[PDB]
Amino acid sequence: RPYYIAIVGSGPSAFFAAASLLKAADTTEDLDMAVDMLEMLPTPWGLVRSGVAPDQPKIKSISKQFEKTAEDPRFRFFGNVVVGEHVQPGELSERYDAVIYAVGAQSDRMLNIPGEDLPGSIAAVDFVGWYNAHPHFEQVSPDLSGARAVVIGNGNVALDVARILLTDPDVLARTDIADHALESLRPRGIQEVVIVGRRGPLQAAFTTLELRELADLDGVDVVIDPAELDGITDEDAAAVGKVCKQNIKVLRGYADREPRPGHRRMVFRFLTSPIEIKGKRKVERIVLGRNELVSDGSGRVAAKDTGEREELPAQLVVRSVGYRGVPTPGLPFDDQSGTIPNVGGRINGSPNEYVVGWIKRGPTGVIGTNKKDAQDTVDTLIKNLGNAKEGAECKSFDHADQVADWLAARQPKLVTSAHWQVIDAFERAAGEPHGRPRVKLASLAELLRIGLG
Amino acid sequence: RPYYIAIVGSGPSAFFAAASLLKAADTTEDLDMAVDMLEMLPTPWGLVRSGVAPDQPKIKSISKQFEKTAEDPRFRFFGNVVVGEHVQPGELSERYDAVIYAVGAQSDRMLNIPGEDLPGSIAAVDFVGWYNAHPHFEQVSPDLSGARAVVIGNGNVALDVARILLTDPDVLARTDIADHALESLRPRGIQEVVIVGRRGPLQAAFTTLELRELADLDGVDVVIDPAELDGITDEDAAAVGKVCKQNIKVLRGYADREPRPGHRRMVFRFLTSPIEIKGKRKVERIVLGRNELVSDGSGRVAAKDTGEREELPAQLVVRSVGYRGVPTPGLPFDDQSGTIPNVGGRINGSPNEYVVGWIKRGPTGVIGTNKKDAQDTVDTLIKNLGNAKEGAECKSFDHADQVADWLAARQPKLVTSAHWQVIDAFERAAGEPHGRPRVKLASLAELLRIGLG
Ligand SMILES: Cc1cc2nc3c(=O)[nH]c(=O)nc-3n(C[C@H](O)[C@H](O)[C@H](O)COP(=O)(O)OP(=O)(O)OC[C@H]3O[C@@H](n4cnc5c(N)ncnc54)[C@H](O)[C@@H]3O)c2cc1C
Ligand SMILES: Cc1cc2nc3c(=O)[nH]c(=O)nc-3n(C[C@H](O)[C@H](O)[C@H](O)COP(=O)(O)OP(=O)(O)OC[C@H]3O[C@@H](n4cnc5c(N)ncnc54)[C@H](O)[C@@H]3O)c2cc1C
Numbered sequence: 001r002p003y004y005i006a007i008v009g010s011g012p013s014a015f016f017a018a019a020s021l022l023k024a025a026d027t028t029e030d031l032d033m034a035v036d037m038l039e040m041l042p043t044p045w046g047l048v049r050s051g052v053a054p055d056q057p058k059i060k061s062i063s064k065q066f067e068k069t070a071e072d073p074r075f076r077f078f079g080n081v082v083v084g085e086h087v088q089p090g091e092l093s094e095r096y097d098a099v100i101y102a103v104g105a106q107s108d109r110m111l112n113i114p115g116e117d118l119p120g121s122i123a124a125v126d127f128v129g130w131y132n133a134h135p136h137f138e139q140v141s142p143d144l145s146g147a148r149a150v151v152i153g154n155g156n157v158a159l160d161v162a163r164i165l166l167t168d169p170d171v172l173a174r175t176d177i178a179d180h181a182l183e184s185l186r187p188r189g190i191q192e193v194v195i196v197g198r199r200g201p202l203q204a205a206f207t208t209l210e211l212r213e214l215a216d217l218d219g220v221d222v223v224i225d226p227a228e229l230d231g232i233t234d235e236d237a238a239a240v241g242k243v244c245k246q247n248i249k250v251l252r253g254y255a256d257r258e259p260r261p262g263h264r265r266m267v268f269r270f271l272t273s274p275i276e277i278k279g280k281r282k283v284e285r286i287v288l289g290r291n292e293l294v295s296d297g298s299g300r301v302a303a304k305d306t307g308e309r310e311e312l313p314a315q316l317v318v319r320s321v322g323y324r325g326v327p328t329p330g331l332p333f334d335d336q337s338g339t340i341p342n343v344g345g346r347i348n349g350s351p352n353e354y355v356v357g358w359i360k361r362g363p364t365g366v367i368g369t370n371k372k373d374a375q376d377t378v379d380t381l382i383k384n385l386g387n388a389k390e391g392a393e394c395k396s397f398d399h400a401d402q403v404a405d406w407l408a409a410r411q412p413k414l415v416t417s418a419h420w421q422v423i424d425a426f427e428r429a430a431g432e433p434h435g436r437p438r439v440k441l442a443s444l445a446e447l448l449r450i451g452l453g
Numbered sequence: 454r455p456y457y458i459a460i461v462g463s464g465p466s467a468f469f470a471a472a473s474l475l476k477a478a479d480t481t482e483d484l485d486m487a488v489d490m491l492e493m494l495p496t497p498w499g500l501v502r503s504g505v506a507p508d509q510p511k512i513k514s515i516s517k518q519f520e521k522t523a524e525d526p527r528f529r530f531f532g533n534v535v536v537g538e539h540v541q542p543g544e545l546s547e548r549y550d551a552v553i554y555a556v557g558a559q560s561d562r563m564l565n566i567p568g569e570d571l572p573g574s575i576a577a578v579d580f581v582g583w584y585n586a587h588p589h590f591e592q593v594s595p596d597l598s599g600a601r602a603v604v605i606g607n608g609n610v611a612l613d614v615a616r617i618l619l620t621d622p623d624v625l626a627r628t629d630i631a632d633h634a635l636e637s638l639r640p641r642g643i644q645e646v647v648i649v650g651r652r653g654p655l656q657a658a659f660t661t662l663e664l665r666e667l668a669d670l671d672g673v674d675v676v677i678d679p680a681e682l683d684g685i686t687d688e689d690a691a692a693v694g695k696v697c698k699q700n701i702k703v704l705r706g707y708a709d710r711e712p713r714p715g716h717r718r719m720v721f722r723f724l725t726s727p728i729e730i731k732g733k734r735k736v737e738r739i740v741l742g743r744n745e746l747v748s749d750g751s752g753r754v755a756a757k758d759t760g761e762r763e764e765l766p767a768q769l770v771v772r773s774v775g776y777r778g779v780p781t782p783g784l785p786f787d788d789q790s791g792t793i794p795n796v797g798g799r800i801n802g803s804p805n806e807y808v809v810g811w812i813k814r815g816p817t818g819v820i821g822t823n824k825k826d827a828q829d830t831v832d833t834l835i836k837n838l839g840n841a842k843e844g845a846e847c848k849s850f851d852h853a854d855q856v857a858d859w860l861a862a863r864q865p866k867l868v869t870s871a872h873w874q875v876i877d878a879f880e881r882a883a884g885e886p887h888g889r890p891r892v893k894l895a896s897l898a899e900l901l902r903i904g905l906g
């Protein structure tokens with residue numbers, strides 16, 4: 001019989017794992033694989049679909065690789081299956097030789113400041129999900145009519161949020177952005193976005209191309225007070241690394257240009273932390289505080305509050321201070337890191353359950369970083385199966401049909417590969433008349449109406 | 454106040470951690486450290502004392518670094534304190550800002566074959582502990598009068614076991630080897646040691662200098678049937694790595710020399726596994742089986758049993774198939790790996806408990822590998838303390854005296870730095886008349902007789 005492997009989640013780490021498993025079978029005598037992928041949403045691809053910005057179709061095109069993997073007769077997809085709800089980890093570990101958890105980071109890190117949950121104060125997780133038509137975020141529906149938005153954080157997601165708020169909606173109309181978001185963005189309500197970083201430019205988590213692309217926003221002025229960069233030398237930057245030296249150059253380039261009255265603006269503020277979000281019933285203003293950089297002995301510089309304060313009117317606050325993993329019922333979890341504890345990708349205390357991607361490593365790295373991660377986990381998984389075989393300890397298992405029928409019993413509204421293909425064709429066809437790659441079905445009800453029709 | 458850090462264990466990873474903590478204090482404004490080291494034995498240094506072979510005084514001399522660290526007034530040692538017995542992890546996490554577990558790997562991996570626990574069949578853990586006068590292994594007392602010993606495994610510990618069994622006892626008489634072991638070795642009972650590796654020479658975990666040093670055994674023939682190496686090319690070796698290419702060369706050099714009748718012998722056998730250990734009431738013979746190398750799809754080659762069998766008379770069997778961590782009461786543990794699950798060195802689910810060394814990484818690497826490991830953990834530890842401080846969440850604490858008195862209440866027979874220094878001076882003085890670096894006190898009773906007199 002082949003080995004039966006379940007993968008939970010369908011993002012990059014899941015697909016890289018699936019490819020690794022099938023390639024091992026393809027290159028190894030007396031080794032065969034069957035892969036079942038269980039996904040919470042009706043649609044695959046995880047953040048490649050729901051995270052990467054709608055103005056980034058080329059980077060999204062890694063999806064072609066995932067499609068090639070899914071063409072394999074040994075591969076099956078079951079969407080609209082929530083592990084922890086419809087089926088439990090213990091049930092999966094008994095019906096499969098091994099199970100790989102590739103669930104990513106489904107929630108947000110909080111600021112832990114007063115006023116944070118006022119209407120108008122949201123996470124990038126919610127805002128990105130909403131603009132990319134993730135069905136769990138359809139009702140986020142932020143008011144985008146106010147003149148100023150504030151984005152907290154200095155990572156690349158912070159730039160995505162700023163860029164989408166200020167991009168010419170005519171440009172966005174040619175993308176797979178959610179129709180509901182395009183509608184809210186069309187009136188161009190936001191006149192200024194302020195990106196607020198707690199440490200300095202040298203500590204920014206941004207990468208260079210992502211900073212450079214802000215120049216392509218037609219008519220939008222990128223504003224940086226030259227005082228944010230004064231005293232930072234080429235030597236200081238080079239001492240952090242190559243990426244930082246390039247970043248600093250690009251930031252100086254923005255600082256060197258005076259903004260134009262009446263133009264939309266993206267403003268970078270460094271050494272600044274949000275202190276308190278204020279308003280009667282919704283966000284009206286934010287209190288910002290100034291930090292200084294201080295060594296804490298860890299080999300990092302820390303931001304330390306100086307006490308200095310200013311208040312800035314604002315109508316939207318988006319915290320882009322990191323995604324965060326969510327515990328899965330039946331599996332161990334590290335609350336502080338939002339990861340599943342593991343040894344070499346094998347789940348703590350488990351002989352046959354594994355982790356890959358952001359649930360294993362934390363929310364760091366580009367899509368490509370998940371490839372070696374998945375390979376390493378898969379190598380270990382296969383080693384462990386082999387050790388069980390040479391010791392004659394492999395499980396005894398029409399098992400493929402039995403499992404598929406059981407999944408259907410637990411979730412009658414599951415979405416097979418075939419039914420995903422229906423959604424996919426529909427969404428792409430919807431984009432044709434107006435020259436968009438696709439128009440997404442933005443709620444579970446709509447996805448299932450098409451998928452399960 | 455300073456931060457109070459407890460370190461559990463006193464081997465290389467513990468001392469590297471201690472140095473890292475104090476250096477951070479020394480190089481950081483508004484950061485001060487007090488380090489308490491709690492050790493199960495009366496004596497410090499872990500495997501530097503009890504593991505590294507008695508014919509390796511130079512490598513043991515890293516102890517000088519540990520001594521320099523212990524000279525710091527901010528550093529305290531408490532030996533004969535067993536964490537999990539005299540004090541519990543929960544009690545330590547409340548009395549200290551952070552606790553670092555550096556307990557190493559205290560038990561052995563088993564072969565899981567019939568006859569394994571017959572008298573005369575032991576682990577390298579027990580055998581090395583016994584010959585290095587580790588007080589938990591004083592009664593191992595193996596019979597060394599029989600002509601043949603068999604050592605299982607192809608790691609550097611396997612070479613230590615073989616080398617000590619066959620070294621001229623006149624040479625060992627000038628070392629810090631346990632007197633009880635020197636007594637058993639003096640009659641030169643063992644005429645042949647057979648080192649049995651399950652995979653091939655290309656897969657050996659030995660390193661090169663360690664293989665080369667076997668040539669320095671005066672009068673002992675290293676025996677390798679040329680057929681063990683036939684068909685292994687320079688190209689095959691180079692494809693594994695530099696160390697392997699050098700190893701293969703050294704092994705060929707041994708194979709190229711015919712053994713001499715009547716000489717003591719060390720024999721290398723590859724592609725061989727122990728199947729069963731036999732005898733009426735003690736080890737009398739071992740059944741060996743032949744393996745072939747087969748890909749299991751993991752990117753390793755696996756050994757697979759061919760079924761071929763031979764029986765070899767043997768009176769001692771030492772399994773050197775890896776050390777193994779032991780669970781600590783109150784802390785999580787991964788049974789399969791024998792490690793404590795952790796995220797970046799922080800213990801799963803804990804805000805202030807950490808791991809370093811072999812309990813974190815598994816039993817791999819030379820002494821020096823623990824240095825960066827400890828540094829990385831300490832960097833994280835200090836970061837986390839700093840984050841707690843900027844948030845005003847640090848514990849409220851004569852605390853040094855209070856803790857020391859509490860330890861004395863729990864363990865009246867604890868061994869202070871001063872009392873270790875007494876043991877140390879006594880043992881070294883004992884070695885003077887016969888030109889030995891020290892003569893170790895080999896039981897807890899003897900250690901305490903001197904230490905606490
Ligand atoms: C806003 C954003 C933009 C990004 N843009 C880029 C970019 O432009 N370029 C780049 O290289 N990288 C980008 N990244 C990084 C990239 O998205 C990640 O590296 C990658 O997606 C992580 O893959 P993953 O498999 O761990 O998780 P995910 O991609 O998050 O996939 C996890 C999958 O698991 C499913 N799941 C979760 N829980 C369950 C459950 N209980 N049961 C069943 N299924 C479950 C989810 O629905 C999801 O489909 C971006 C990340 C974000 C957050
Ligand atoms: C036989 C042997 C020979 C070796 N020879 C060499 C060599 O020649 N060169 C080289 O570079 N490396 C050598 N090594 C590797 C080296 O010993 C390890 O890399 C290193 O010692 C691991 O350090 P550690 O701190 O993790 O653990 P250890 O050195 O094992 O120290 C752990 C300490 O924790 C204490 N402890 C355990 N449990 C408790 C408890 N519950 N409460 C209080 N204390 C506790 C122990 O008593 C011990 O003192 C050898 C290893 C072995 C096994």
Ligand SMILES: NC(=O)C1C=[N+]([C@@H]2O[C@H](COP(=O)(O)OP(=O)(O)OC[C@H]3O[C@@H](n4cnc5c(N)ncnc54)[C@H](OP(=O)(O)O)[C@@H]3O)[C@@H](O)[C@H]2O)C=CC1=O
Binds near residue numbers: 111197210273321323
């Ligand atoms: N094109 C690309 O390569 C992209 C890549 N990503 C990749 O995905 C991950 C996640 O991105 P994301 O921006 O969410 O996270 P990070 O890069 O870690 O940046 C987090 C920032 O948040 C900041 N943060 C965290 N807590 C706070 C508080 N309390 N106040 C203020 N600021 C805070 C953090 O600041 P810090 O460095 O800790 O001082 C980062 O700037 C990260 O590795 C990205 O590079 C994401 C989007 C892309 O477009």
Ligand SMILES: NC(=O)C1C=[N+]([C@@H]2O[C@H](COP(=O)(O)OP(=O)(O)OC[C@H]3O[C@@H](n4cnc5c(N)ncnc54)[C@H](OP(=O)(O)O)[C@@H]3O)[C@@H](O)[C@H]2O)C=CC1=O
Binds near residue numbers: 652817
């Ligand atoms: N001078 C030095 O640098 C020294 C260094 N050490 C270092 O300490 C660690 C531990 O050494 P140790 O020899 O205990 O372990 P390893 O190097 O991992 O070697 C283990 C070997 O055991 C073998 N093993 C494991 N299970 C079995 C079974 N079931 N049957 C037969 N053989 C088995 C294993 O074989 P494998 O590679 O898995 O096929 C290694 O050869 C290792 O990293 C050493 O290099 C130890 C002693 C030294 O002298």
Ligand code: NA
Binds near residue numbers: 053156159
């Ligand atoms: Na981006």
Ligand code: NA
Binds near residue numbers: 609612613663
């Ligand atoms: Na050695």
